[PDB]
Amino acid sequence: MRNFPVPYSNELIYSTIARAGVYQGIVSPKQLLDEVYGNRKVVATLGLPSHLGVIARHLHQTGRYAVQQLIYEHTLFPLYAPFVGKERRDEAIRLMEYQAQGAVHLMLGVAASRVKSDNRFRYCPDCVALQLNRYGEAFWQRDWYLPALPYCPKHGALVFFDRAVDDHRHQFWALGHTELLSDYPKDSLSQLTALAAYIAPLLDAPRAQELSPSLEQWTLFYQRLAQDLGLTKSKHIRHDLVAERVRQTFSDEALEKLDLKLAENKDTCWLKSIFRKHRKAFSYLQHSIVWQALLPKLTVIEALQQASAL
Amino acid sequence: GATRIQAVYRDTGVEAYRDNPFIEALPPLQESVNSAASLKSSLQLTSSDLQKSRVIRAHTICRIPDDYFQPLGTHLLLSERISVMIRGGYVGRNPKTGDLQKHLQNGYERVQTGELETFRFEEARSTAQSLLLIGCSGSGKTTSLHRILATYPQVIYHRELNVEQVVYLKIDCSHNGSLKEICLNFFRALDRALGSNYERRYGLKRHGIETMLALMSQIANAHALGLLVIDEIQHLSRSRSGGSQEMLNFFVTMVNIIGVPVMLIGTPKAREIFEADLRSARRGAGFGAIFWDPIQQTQRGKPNQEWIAFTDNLWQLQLLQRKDALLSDEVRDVWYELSQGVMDIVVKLFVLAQLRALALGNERITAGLLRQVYQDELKPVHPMLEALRSGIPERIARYSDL
Amino acid sequence: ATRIQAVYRDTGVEAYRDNPFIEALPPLQESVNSAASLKSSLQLTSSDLQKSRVIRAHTICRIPDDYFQPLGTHLLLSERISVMIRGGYVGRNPKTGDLQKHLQNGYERVQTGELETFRFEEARSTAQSLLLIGCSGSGKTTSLHRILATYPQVIYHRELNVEQVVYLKIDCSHNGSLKEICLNFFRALDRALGSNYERRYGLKRHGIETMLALMSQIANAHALGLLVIDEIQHLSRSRSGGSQEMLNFFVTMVNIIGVPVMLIGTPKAREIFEADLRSARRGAGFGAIFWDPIQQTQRGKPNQEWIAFTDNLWQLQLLQRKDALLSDEVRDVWYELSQGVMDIVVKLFVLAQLRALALGNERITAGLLRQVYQDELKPVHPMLEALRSGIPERIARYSDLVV
Amino acid sequence: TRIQAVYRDTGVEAYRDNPFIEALPPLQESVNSAASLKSSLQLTSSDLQKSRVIRAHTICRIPDDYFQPLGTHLLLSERISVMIRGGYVGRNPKTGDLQKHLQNGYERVQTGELETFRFEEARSTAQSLLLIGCSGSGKTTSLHRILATYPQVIYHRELNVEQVVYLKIDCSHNGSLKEICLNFFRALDRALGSNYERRYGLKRHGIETMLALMSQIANAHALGLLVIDEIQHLSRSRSGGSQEMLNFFVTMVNIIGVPVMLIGTPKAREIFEADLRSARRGAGFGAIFWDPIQQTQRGKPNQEWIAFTDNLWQLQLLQRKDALLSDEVRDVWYELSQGVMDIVVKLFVLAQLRALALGNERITAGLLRQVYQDELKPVHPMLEALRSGIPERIARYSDLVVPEIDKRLIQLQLDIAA
Ligand SMILES: Nc1ncnc2c1ncn2[C@@H]1O[C@H](COP(=O)(O)OP(=O)(O)OP(=O)(O)O)[C@@H](O)[C@H]1O
Ligand SMILES: Nc1ncnc2c1ncn2[C@@H]1O[C@H](COP(=O)(O)OP(=O)(O)OP(=O)(O)O)[C@@H](O)[C@H]1O
Ligand SMILES: Nc1ncnc2c1ncn2[C@@H]1O[C@H](COP(=O)(O)OP(=O)(O)O)[C@@H](O)[C@H]1O
Ligand SMILES: [Mg+2]
Ligand SMILES: [Mg+2]
Ligand SMILES: [Mg+2]
Ligand SMILES: [Zn+2]
């Protein structure tokens, strides 16, 4: 490619490639895939893409954009980076430069969701106005595409519409304003916008690049937090106090909206699993909900620093 | 193909040219006094080169037409106009305040729908402006342009952005009034100046005429092309049915809507094509038409300073062991009479006369030798220069390109 | 068909400096000493008067294919051709130095303000084109072949990877269509090199303007110095192009690629170019060479060239009763029956020699030449009669001779 | 015809070490050229008294088995021999390691010791001859006899090239410019052993591809001549015009060497004679015209005509045969025949078969007059055209011939039997 667009601030690399396609008038998706990559047997995805390195070579002349910058500043990697581990994170980072499309989605256990969770395209009504009044274009943003939060952190709620990623797996789609956005009346809770705004700063943080605890570290940090809050018995649990803490902090409607409905009647529950020994990579929400319910005056960055300190 | 030059930003003093990098990376325009010496060129002609053998000494005389230029009193105006229309055509495509990207976003509708006038943003203006260049053949329409545009780096690469700014591009029409070969020649000239492959990527898919028209204009804005120059516009006069108007409309919709300035060079045979309609002429000739005429001996009752400063300056490039220190008025008179002011005939006649003077043995240039060379080695161009010499409008009405 | 390794030489011309294409050619020779490089004649014809009759008859048949005596008008053509070949490579200099740093430094210095004006790289302008027009039978192909025989065709540069095709000779399309001029080029590129092109680059979907680029992609990859188009008179009254489309190709090809083009034609082809200034200025790009039949007398004296050319050929006889001296009557009859045309000299001599050998009498007289003219030269009679008349329109009735 | 290669040197220097030239039969003077083609019927005295049927068949075999060379056979033979042996000079296989010679010459001319040098070997002037004449005047039978002297195919042990000295091709009655290549293939795969027509000469390829393959195959084998006989059969309408067929025949020089011989009626002359350009290339080695033999080319009647008449006269097989031939018979033969070799023997055999049919067993002048007035109705236009000597009626009726006279001979034999 001769003129690969410079990515904007806080934008998905998928939208960067889509804008590269829309700039040079490549209507046919196959031609675009051949020109950008050279292999017609790839899979396009939103967040955690693969085949990186060819894009960084397309941006070779500009010295700032490298593989690390694109990995940590234009994909959804920061959400999956600290919680998954250290050696697994390093292996995933090393693997993103290669052509293993399924490996990035498979090795990260948190990313191994099999069936896509709402593969439809999202957008925010107010953010498009700001983007048009500042940059002149419309593009996907890492704030909107949280894996399980359909809520913009600054504003109230997103607005879905037709089409989905899996509808056409060989095409890159770019949002358009004049194409009438499917705006219809929306109602949103005020207990989830706060969670979105609490999780949002984790995306843009230089400290998160070299900050990722381990499984045993996670277990020790959670046990120490439970000991400090006093919600645990002698080598046991209150088994109810942790329930009403999250019940008061977050309503049941929000939890059922996020598909984390409480099941304290049954032993098997995500909260109980978190309190117990940690055996895999829990998603970001399972940590953020507990963090906001237990320590409301600490944000994500210093919480991660305290967890990884000991 | 063309060397790529990194960009350095100066400080333009114009309020309208506030921060636009495209018109901040361009070299500054010189003054009127320096425009008559920034283009002049001449052969070295070492004074020790007169003692060499005939065969070696005669292979440097044949370099005079290629390496001799004297800027007249019109090249200044042409250069000023070119600079104005190449700097004022970038104010509508400022990349800093999100204005170039709006033009590209409007270009997806044309490549997707096929209708060129499909506006998506109503706040994207066009200020390209257009120029027309007409002059008799052999008067130096291309040799002046290749020396005026030679002061611009063509391909400039910006590092803060990732855009390769092609300052100017030079193409020419097809021998027939083609509709698709023009769009293919655009790609063929574009990838050669960039070392890419655009001709294969666009065209091998067997696209339609309108789709190709949209593809060409979209890549003409993906790279911030500043000036499009099409050479020998008289070619399209031999088009098919409708070929003499479709591209006349396309070249007035590229400069008025898309925003890329265009300059067209052609012999006076294209005036019939370009006078088809007022709305098809004035829009395509916004600056008007620049008419070029051969040098005239006398302007205000006295000998022209241009003709004298051309002839007397050329006279000092003689590789003759028995050359003349001064130029007699008789030699000048016969030289003008046997050339009729055309740029090409003067230099070619001088070179041929000098070569024959070397070959014969008598190394002195005289009116008789000039006449003999003219009658010997200028056979095809006799009747037309004769018609120009006569001055009768009826004779000039046919051919002679005037 | 043969690749010759290059050995580098030096030239005193400052315009060439260090140019591989110019300095790989033979050295610069003077015009007067370049006329002895073309002369050739039959050898061993000293004691072949006593062998037999069949041998002495078969030997004479090779005279037109081995006798070549340069005239005084070949110096100009040779000099023009050499200048055109060498001067077409100044623009296409392959050995480019560290231009990037120089241009960058100049651009920075003119942007800062220290320098007032800087000039960047510029492309090569149009190259010169020569027009050779002459009556048929004056040797417009033999002269070109013997002149170009001193320049090797394909030279391979060890340092580079481009095969320099110094010259290349084709003929115009027989029916005047552009599509076959575009194909004779590909055909001729294959008999001179070892690769194939007729099927690889002979795709029919390309238009004539696309054919321009298709042949450009191979005429610029190589270092083609000349492209001579013989028999240009066929373009007149063609089918594909109506007014000027035939040479609208060549003007663009010269402007863009820059390979010098030499056009060889017949006085019928003058009207093709003499129509407008745009095309006539390019037909006579580097002067126009017009040829005429040899004149018996020059000013008030007999021409020395005719006498020398006749007396040089007169010594190739293979008859037993050959005459050392040539009587003026025989020369007068020869010129009368030849009218100065080059071809009607060697043929009229060879046929007379063969008839004398077969008849039995080993001599040539005026009667024998007259009889062989009356018998064997029948189809040429009207045009030589037109030459005898000398009326411009009477000659102009036929369209392959100077009128 | 597969004849091996034997080399015998000749005194010409220009043919020093050319294997193809020396593989041909040795050069011969006029005596051998005119003596190797003479042929006549034996007609021993023992067959005079036998059945009329066998004698009738023997008489019918006369026109095929009788030939008398006239005064142009030696000229034609010499011209053809020179043409075949002069078309290999630029195509000779005697080319050693020329790379060393060229490299040494280039090295020496770059040092100033060698002033000049020549770097080309493609020295072969385009040789051709357009041999045309009146139809039936002997442009095919005499050409067959001349070309039969040279072997068609020569095989060299050291090399691996099959030299095709000559090749003759004919045109269909309707005629077209495309069937020529197919005829070339169908003649080559018979002269040689291969499957060129099946392997390469398919129906898919166009005429230009046919010509391109024809040039390559003519360069693979050393083709010394190309004979196209009676181009009159080629149509001027289906081909496309009166200039484009000339243009194709001119393009037929692109074949490397291969001096082509074009044979046709004088109606094709107007196609070539239009300017000195074609009057020069057409007659590259002179102009030779086939004409009917005149009785009196000089003041004395031609010895060739008298010898021909006498030799045909002594070929009579009759019970009552007169040795002497009347002068009136010869005068009548001229007047009815005008020197055309096609019809002289035809008239003789027709009259001497009608003699058998009537049982007269003798030849009379009145019978000659009767058979002339009776049998030759279709061919009269040429007869009175030649008697009047007008070339216009000769040319405008030169494509007329007697229609299937062998069949008429068959019913004549049937009537004789009945
Ligand atoms: N002002 C000038 N001073 C000196 N030489 C000049 C001048 N103008 C033109 N020439 C010479 O005259 C010739 C004109 O060449 P060029 O290709 O520019 O012609 P042109 O006018 O563009 O032709 P056309 O209209 O046919 O395209 C060249 O040899 C050039 O060097
Ligand atoms: N300089 C010469 N000196 C002597 N004989 C010559 C010379 N040039 C040509 N001839 C003879 O005259 C003949 C003319 O044939 P040639 O092919 O040269 O003609 P031409 O004029 O080039 O043809 P065309 O009309 O195709 O351009 C040559 O074959 C040769 O025999
Ligand atoms: N020299 C000859 N003697 C006798 N008959 C001849 C002679 N030449 C030709 N013919 C007759 O001419 C006929 C063939 O004619 P042909 O030469 O094919 O005419 P064309 O060449 O015009 O087609 C044969 O049947 C043969 O009998
Ligand atoms: Mg021009
Ligand atoms: Mg010729
Ligand atoms: Mg026949
Ligand atoms: Zn928002």
UniProtKB/Swiss-Prot annotation, chain A:
Establish whether keyword DNA-binding is in the entry.
Answer: yes
- The UniProt annotation gives the DNA-binding region as 222-241
| One Gene Ontology molecular-function label | DNA binding
**Record flagged with keyword DNA-binding:** yes
Q: Which UniProt keywords apply?
A: DNA recombination, DNA-binding, Plasmid, Transposable element, Transposition
Where is the secretion signal located?
Answer: none
Give TM regions. Answer: none
Give the source's domain of life in one word.
Bacteria
Q: Which GO terms describe its biological process?
A: DNA recombination; transposition
Role, per record? Required for Tn7 transposition. It may at least play a role in DNA sequence recognition. It seems to be required for specific binding to a region of att-Tn7.
Q: What is this protein called?
A: Transposon Tn7 transposition protein TnsD
- Provenance organism: Escherichia coli
Swiss-Prot record, chain B:
Give a yes or no for keyword Nucleus in this entry: no
One of this protein's GO BP terms?
A: DNA recombination
Q: Which residues bind DNA?
A: 387-402
Q: Provide the residue positions that the database annotates as binding ATP.
A: G135, C136, S137, G138, S139, G140, K141, T142
Which UniProt keywords are listed?
ATP-binding, DNA recombination, DNA-binding, Nucleotide-binding, Plasmid, Transposable element, Transposition
Question: Looking at the keywords, is ATP-binding present?
Answer: yes
Q: Name one GO molecular function term.
A: ATP hydrolysis activity
Q: How does it assemble?
A: Monomer. Interacts (via C-terminus) with TnsA; this interaction allows TnsA to bind donor DNA.
Q: What does this protein do?
A: TnsC binds non-specifically to DNA in the presence of ATP. It is required for Tn7 transposition. TnsABC + TnsD promote high-frequency insertion of Tn7 into a specific target site known as att-Tn7 whereas TnsABC + TnsE promote low-frequency insertion into many different sites.
Q: What is this protein called?
A: Transposon Tn7 transposition protein TnsC
Gene of this entry: tnsC
